[PDB]
Amino acid sequence: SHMTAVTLDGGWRVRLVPGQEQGKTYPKAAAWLPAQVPGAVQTDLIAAKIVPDPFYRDNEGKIQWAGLSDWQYQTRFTVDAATLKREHVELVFDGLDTFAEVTLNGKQLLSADNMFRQWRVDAKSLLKRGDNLLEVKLYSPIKKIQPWLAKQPYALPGAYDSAFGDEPEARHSSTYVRKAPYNFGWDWGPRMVNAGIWKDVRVEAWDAVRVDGLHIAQQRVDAHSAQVQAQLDLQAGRSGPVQVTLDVLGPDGQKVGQFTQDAVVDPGQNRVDLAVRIANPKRWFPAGYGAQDRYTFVASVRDADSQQIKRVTGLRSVELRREKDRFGKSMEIVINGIPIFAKGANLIPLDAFPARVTHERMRSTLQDARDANMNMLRMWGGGHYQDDYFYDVADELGIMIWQDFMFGGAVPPYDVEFRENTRQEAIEQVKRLRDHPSLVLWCGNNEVQTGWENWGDRVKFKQSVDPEERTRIERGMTTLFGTVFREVVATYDSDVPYWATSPGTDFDGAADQTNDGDMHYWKVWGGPALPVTEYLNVTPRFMSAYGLQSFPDMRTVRAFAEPGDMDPESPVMRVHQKFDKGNGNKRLMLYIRREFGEPKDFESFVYLSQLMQAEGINIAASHLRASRPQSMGSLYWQLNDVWPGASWSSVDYYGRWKALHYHARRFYAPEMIAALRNDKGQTEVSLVSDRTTPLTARWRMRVMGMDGKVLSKREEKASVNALSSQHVGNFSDKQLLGSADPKRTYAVFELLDGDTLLSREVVFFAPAKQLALPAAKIDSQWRADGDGYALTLTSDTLAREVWLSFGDVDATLSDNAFDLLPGEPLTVRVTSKAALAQLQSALQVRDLAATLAGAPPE
Amino acid sequence: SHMTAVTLDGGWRVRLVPGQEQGKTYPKAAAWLPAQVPGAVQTDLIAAKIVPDPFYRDNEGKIQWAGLSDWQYQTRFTVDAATLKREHVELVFDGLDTFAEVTLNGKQLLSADNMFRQWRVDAKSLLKRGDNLLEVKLYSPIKKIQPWLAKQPYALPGAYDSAFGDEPEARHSSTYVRKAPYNFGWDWGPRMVNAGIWKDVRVEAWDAVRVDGLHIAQQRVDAHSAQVQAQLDLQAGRSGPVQVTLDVLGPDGQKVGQFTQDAVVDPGQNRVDLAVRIANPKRWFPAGYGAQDRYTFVASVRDADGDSQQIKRVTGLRSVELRREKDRFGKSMEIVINGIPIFAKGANLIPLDAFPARVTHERMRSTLQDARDANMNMLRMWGGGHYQDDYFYDVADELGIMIWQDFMFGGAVPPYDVEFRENTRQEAIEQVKRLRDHPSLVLWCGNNEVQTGWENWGDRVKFKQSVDPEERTRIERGMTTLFGTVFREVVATYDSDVPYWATSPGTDFDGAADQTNDGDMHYWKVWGGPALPVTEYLNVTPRFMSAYGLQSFPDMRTVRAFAEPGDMDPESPVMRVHQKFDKGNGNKRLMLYIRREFGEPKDFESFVYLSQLMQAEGINIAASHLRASRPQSMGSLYWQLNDVWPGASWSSVDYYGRWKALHYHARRFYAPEMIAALRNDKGQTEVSLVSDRTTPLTARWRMRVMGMDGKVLSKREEKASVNALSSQHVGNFSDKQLLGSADPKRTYAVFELLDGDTLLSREVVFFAPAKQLALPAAKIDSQWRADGDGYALTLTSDTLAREVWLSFGDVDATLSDNAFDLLPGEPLTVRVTSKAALAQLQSALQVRDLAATLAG
């Protein structure tokens, strides 16, 4: 009949290839173990209790040997009556990580060398009735490449040194292998050089025609119409007639149209195209700009006996607008003719072990983005291309994906074999992902050009080789990221833009400029470690990375640590800090101390760390939105985590929100007031509106003594054009304070519609550690709210950065890390299965002033 | 209703833009003078007798001012009431050379800055009933670019210095303007920095829909079927229905398919694609590999008003593969057409005139027929020229001459600014869309010699090592983007069934340019550089040879056309002006090669003939060697086919279309079945039977060793079976075996390939340079016979006569053969084609041979 597929994900065992030193050291791993597919031998070893959980305390080093070893997977499967007589029977590996040799009933069947490629092999003649034996050998990429690398004239500038000394300094095998770069350890992740059959394996069988894919190519989309072309790829083993029927369903569920096309297919590849025009399309818009409407395209193929394939897709135009203006050349994402200031963050993998990521976690990550008012995530090139399901959720929720190809910043080799291996990966990933409306941009890599131009080790490298070799290496990069990826996108996903490298100017000129293209800014946190107010002096056309570190939630810390470890410079805490080769808690202390002095205890440390991060990023993100149209994007580093540890994330490994993620919802709000005080004692006030209509609204400013008294009060009408930022005042300290003590005085700025409160920013005139913050009495009052509750908070005085917690009880909050103002109640919604009485007793309430009180000197 | 178009080519006049010093110097140019459109102001001046013909003697210099000046074209044209009532009225310029500013009824209309671009402009609101005043101002690219260039930190390497000192040394404006590189002077052509409206101008008007193009996109083609997509590009002003009908006609003009598609168009651009599958297609094949079968696709577009417009494409169904596979010689490079690996046999094609606008269809056709007649299957259209006229490509489709199409970059390092890059991208798009449906265009190529120059030419090396390394990286990046990304992407987007090639010679940016074991090669160590003996050709065997050559002078009639008796000396000022290699001192290099083989020419006419013999025989060695080496090499494109003006060059056919000896030899060394008998410098003669047939060749070959005095020394004959598409070595003979102590100065060997009694191919081998031989004194008998339209001329020599050359003074006549060897006693009949009377022909007939030329 039609094609069939059977998944070979069960019955798998695994062990060390016989003869390795690791087999003597780990004899249990020399014998067969149950193996997960999809999975990793690493997680297989963990499940079998041969090694302890590498995420817990200091166990990271105990599993490093597995990445240095060669592995042998085995399974047995049966092929039945019907299957063996089909005209085609193929084995299909969706993911082999990475250097793989596949054997079927003892005969060599496939060599593989790309974690991101799908491998399809003709199996029919080698199969048999009943028991078949499938074997997959996986070779350590470190062990494989290093002996070859040791013999080379030079090693290309790579990624991170091994903390375990199993690779030479500045001689990294990772740049020579198409494998997720973060597997080799990063500056927020452990070194887990995974080996695995990390995606599904199938037996597939078919007769006359195989349906190789469906793509809805959008040719032009506007409000009047969408002209699309449904493109069907068909493999035929012989020449014959086919009949294709295409059904098109609206977002409402209605029936838009039915379309048919007859064709004769010929042996090999065949393309059958059906044009569809939709009048007055219900287009797909990013979050905050309308509905995430989508159409469904269902095609059937009758050959000489039918077959079904379905594509859900969203109609929209995408333009990367780069227009000359007074700040140079712009960079802005334009969806359905709407210029969208990009609001979001950088997305890294969801786990050190990618095969074990649940749908729930993928969905949760995106819903977190959504709830924090983000409209774009950048999928950073040091990770892996995501699961289909992840992209489904981004389509549904309206989170735009800026999709890096998976180059993380190492300098690639220029040999043809590497290039062509990478091309086929690119083609496969672009074909896989192209029909997701959320995928609006493709980007060749993370930071390769800017590293080559600005990082000391690249600069030293490129000047130490002969200039003729430098040209070869640069020609390699230019071709890979300027031609190969660009052409794959142009061929297979032609309606979306391509970008050579982030950050860059698409190879027009140099990387990382402030008046053209995008920028990653790291002079704050990294490098000279400048004060966070320096963020106010940087304004590129698009900021695609910047950030600050903080510790995860308390619950998360207890999850990888035990009381003996509860110190910023404990061995276990050090292991969980990956920045600045293990001594990055000093950098964190630097920033914490500047604003808050010395934390009283480890609890306050975690909190202050999250405040330092949250308040720092608020400065930058607000500054950038306020600068429109000078800037048109803010993607902070980073959204998420791979493991329990310190990082730049706003949401930790267990989905727990940091203070940053709650602040993010505010500074990314559709209507926002920015009031940002610079180091010159100048406070600039702007009203920002992402609305497509005019905003008629008022704003007010109030100057307050911390003793509770009002000093001055101003209010004005405001008319803000659509999609703009309007500067509405610029106030020196003298103007705001008069002779009032800066250490005892603050300012409140609010934006209102009618008198519904849209946004608020509270301004201070000194580092918090120098303030005379009042001691707040905060009043709790609960109330049923259906399945959840309403918690109302009232403070007699200013309370800064109020943090609500419930110990180990499970409850999430509509808001947290907020300011309370004198006599002004704030109600949050508490979601929890726990009863009112238990949330009563569990509730802990922390604030800045109470936290700073009783603190030691520095 | 349906779109209408009026060509605005009549009634132009032209003059210097007022206010220039040249207006004082050339008062007649300051006044209005008739202008020809298409044309050049240069040729308008010549027609007006304001300057003498720059092709004649040393008149080149007298017209240089015109390239340094700004020009004002003007014409009046009428627009009727109906046109003004169409929904759309546009002016279209197919070609402005180059920096142009267009004005209509005194209002600025269009700025243009690319010779190779088409410019369409909305004109309707500016037009008026009755008379309209159209003006085009053209600005000298030199005068415009040089003051800017002078303020730059460096100038990019590229092109030729001005022999007239009107641009500083190694600071060339041409690099920065999109204009035919050879206009600024080249090493076989004069400096004619043309300004002109050099292609047609039209007023076009349309209502509901404008049909912007038809393209037949070949998806897959084999013997069993061709799956194609007829792609219609429709411009609409308003939303509404269209019905498209498509007729498909086979090579015999009979309908092989009929198709219908309805669609609704919307404002702007629309694509209507019709899938067509042709069962058992009659595919297009290159010359020598079958018929040049073509299908005609006729589309009719009924718009929403119910009006119909027709558009047509004649095309050829064929698969093209650039096959590059690892083998014992490295990595191959061969073009494969309809599954047949074709050894490429041909030459490099340059423009047909220094003034491309006056080239006739007749000259285009004749150029391609010459190639056909010399057994060529491929011309490379070299990037220093211009994209050719539509008609030229039609004729190539017709005759089966494949075109290797360079984009028009000739070797200069280009600047890396975005504006230049995007200007060029639009030129690429427009050219690829215009040319894509010619089956003859089988490959697109980024440029001529940019990479190999950058890597191997002293001035580029010096230049790139002199700038800051960060600047070197910026320039290299600009190149790699332009030639590696932009052009590749245009071809992939708009002509995706043909291969793209970043640069000739090269490896497509995989690695370095000009390798012997990967990609193609331009080889110039013979003629150029160290100037090696021509037998060194036997030592050079790249995977594909896409340029190489030797110079010669043009036909004596062509020489007489541009020089007078007083000028007939190779070092006369006039002959030097017409020698453009090495700053006019190329006759030194020419004499080097001539003297090496033949000694000192007797007189000037002997100099011309020996120059042609030197070139013919030298190229013979190389071309024969490359074919005999198959599959090590899989292409021979010699530099060059043709000329842009009368002068010394590497061409085999001169500016007036007169065949040189090389062209007659080319027909022999490119013959489908060929015997190669090649003696190297160590006295070893390798004999190969070369067969381009797609079937086994069952044949015999033979050899006869002869004394100059007529005696027969030895003979041997042998049956041979030659595989399809192959070269078979069938002997290697030392001088000792061939000569057996006979004097090498007094002995020759004849090699022959036969099929049955039919002689297919003959090679005559010698054992010493001609100037060392004891060539016998030949007595050549000639006898004429009427042959219907023309005449049969039978020549019979009593001794060997080498390289017999037939001519008729200034009497016109063409020959079926020339520059041939006569063997003692063996008559050769040549067909003589001529309007002239037999009486005049017999009277004018001159017979030259090598021994008599060398006899002093």
Ligand SMILES: OC[C@H]1O[C@@H](O)[C@@H](O)[C@@H](O)[C@@H]1O
């Ligand atoms: O250093 C924090 C992060 O900053 C980003 O810009 C990239 O360089 C990442 O690879 C890195 O992990």
Ligand SMILES: OC[C@H]1O[C@@H](O)[C@@H](O)[C@@H](O)[C@@H]1O
């Ligand atoms: O030197 C003769 C010719 O050689 C070719 O390879 C190119 O370099 C041409 O530009 C040149 O005119």
